[PDB]
């Protein structure tokens, strides 16, 4: 975790390695900011709704600002992300283009009115596939089971 | 089962052997056999062979119906056999003793079936498919 | 062949190093008529797809054997834990 305290390629695997040793450890300092800080960085890469809000009631460790910025990107406009940023201002962890990136993932349709509007080789669009597209994800779980062998070497 | 013998019809009257050869103090020691072994006295059977003889003795199918209808099959038994594995782990978690009543000789067999099913496809749904590549 | 019903006089004769280890112009003109395939539009897409589907199958599996392997882990750990 202290190595977790820039790059975002491995902050989540060090988040899995980080969020392990705290049955009941502290109430300030060590136990607190690892979870909420690392899931904030997990939004600094851009990971949105479905691990966020129902995973909150385990900690509930003063719980205002970072969750508020998570839905401030989950919606994704600068107008109320402003008052998340400037009106709070003490939230710390100071170290904008990402909530821009969310709304322009849509487009109006694709081009957006002859290359110009605002919101505020596999001819398919990226659904699934039976070639190189889905193969990457496939060999994810295979790798996991192989790495899970370690279990057999423990008795 | 090969064994030669002697003429010990008569002559109950040398061969250090390293202590009587071993494996004829272990026959199937049965009285009519050992009473026959009074006359018999087997000794050994050696064996020869050559490398030549030794050495001498020593695809596809893809979606015909094949790949589908042996992963359309086995995943269904993984479904409801994993439901019976759920029932096994729920059930034997408590009130279990004496090696699960001797491994359920009756209603054989939950869990192992899942292991066998897992083994069957991962030798097939990879390997020759691998050679497809 | 297979040597049916008399492989007893073969499997006794298959000692040192064992079976596996046990314990471990017209015709050639018509040869290259059926060779060429890099045309990935259709065929390529199909090949991609099948691989994905079978890969998935393996991922599904390589999971339930990991689970039952973990069940053997907790069996051994509670066994030697009770042998403490």
């Amino acid at each position: 975790y202290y190595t977790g305290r820039l790059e975002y390629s491995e902050a989540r695997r060090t988040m899995t390695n980080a969020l392990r040793k705290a049955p009941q450890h502290t109430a300030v300092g060590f136990k607190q900011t690892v979870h909420k800080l690392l899931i904030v960085v997990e939004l600094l890469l851009g990971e949105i709704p479905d691990r966020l809000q129902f995973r909150q009631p385990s900690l509930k460790r003063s719980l205002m600002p970072y969750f508020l910025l998570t839905q401030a990107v989950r919606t994704g406009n600068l107008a109320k992300f402003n008052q998340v940023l400037d009106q709070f201002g003490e939230k710390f962890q100071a170290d904008i283009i990402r909530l821009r990136h969310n709304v322009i993932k849509t487009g109006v349709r694709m081009i957006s009115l002859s290359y110009s509007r605002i919101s505020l080789s596999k001819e398919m669009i990226d659904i699934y596939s039976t070639r190189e597209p889905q193969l990457a994800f496939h060999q994810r779980i295979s790798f996991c089971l192989d790495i899970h062998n370690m279990s057999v070497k423990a008795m | 089962v090969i064994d030669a013998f002697r003429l010990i019809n008569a002559n109950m009257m040398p061969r250090q052997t390293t202590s009587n050869l071993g494996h004829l103090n272990k026959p199937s020691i049965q009285a009519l056999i050992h009473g026959l072994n009074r006359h018999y006295y087997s000794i050994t059977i050696n064996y020869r062979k050559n490398e030549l003889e030794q050495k001498m003795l020593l695809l596809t199918l893809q979606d015909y119906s094949e790949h589908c209808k042996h992963n359309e099959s086995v995943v269904k038994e993984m479904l409801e056999l994993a439901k019976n594995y759920n029932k096994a782990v729920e059930e034997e978690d408590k009130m279990t003793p004496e090696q699960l009543a001797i491994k359920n000789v009756g209603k054989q067999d939950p869990k192992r079936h899942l292991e066998e099913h897992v083994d069957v496809l991962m030798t097939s749904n990879i390997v020759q498919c691998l050679a497809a590549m | 062949g297979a040597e049916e019903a008399e492989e007893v006089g073969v499997e006794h004769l298959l000692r040192d190093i064992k079976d596996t280890t046990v314990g471990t112009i017209y015709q050639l003109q018509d040869v290259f008529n059926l060779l060429p395939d890099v045309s990935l539009q259709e065929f390529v897409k199909a090949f991609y797809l099948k691989t994905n589907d079978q890969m998935v199958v393996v991922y599904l599996a390589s999971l339930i054997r990991s689970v039952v392997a973990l069940h053997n882990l907790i069996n051994n750990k509670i066994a030697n834990r009770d042998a403490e």
């Binding site: 193969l135 060999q139 192989d146 062998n149 | 991962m122 990879i126 691998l130 590549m133 | 691989t51 390589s62």
Partner: peptide, 8 residues
Amino acid sequence: QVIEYMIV
């Protein structure tokens, strides 16, 4: 993926 394609 032939290189990529531990189980034993």
